């Protein structure tokens, strides 16, 4: 429950501002990269190179509290099991953008 506060920091997500929302995925890298060969769907931005994971994945939702303030960025850590949706690109075809989870 202090996870998001550490994680946002170790991953340089609180460098100049506090990243409001951020999602971390706890599956193997291999499983997450495999999503690129799963259900093809529209990205929020309108491109058509997003994919949704056939399976729910173990994830963690990091959202800043209403009271948080740089440099002491504060986060609510919510764990969840959800289908993720990533944009894939390049060779190897791998995720390059987290898009959403359902």
């Amino acid at each position: 429950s202090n996870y998001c506060n550490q994680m946002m920091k170790s991953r340089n997500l609180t460098k100049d501002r506090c990243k409001p929302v951020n999602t971390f995925v706890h599956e193997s890298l291999a499983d997450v990269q495999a999503v690129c060969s799963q259900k093809n769907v529209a990205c929020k931005n309108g491109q058509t190179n997003c994919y949704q994971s056939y399976s729910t994945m173990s994830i963690t939702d990091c959202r800043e509290t209403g009271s948080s303030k740089y440099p002491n960025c504060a986060y609510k850590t919510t764990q969840a099991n959800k289908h993720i949706i990533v944009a894939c690109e390049g060779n190897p075809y791998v995720p390059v953008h987290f898009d959403a989870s359902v």
Binding site: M7, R11, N12, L13, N22, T23, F24, V25, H26, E27, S28, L29, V32, T60, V86, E89, G90, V94, P95, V96, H97, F98
Partner: peptide, 15 residues
């Protein structure tokens, strides 16, 4: 400048 794939791991991967 960090390959977009690296960025995604730094940002969303905690295996």
């Amino acid at each position: 400048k960090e390959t977009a794939a690296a960025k995604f791991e730094r940002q969303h991967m905690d295996s």
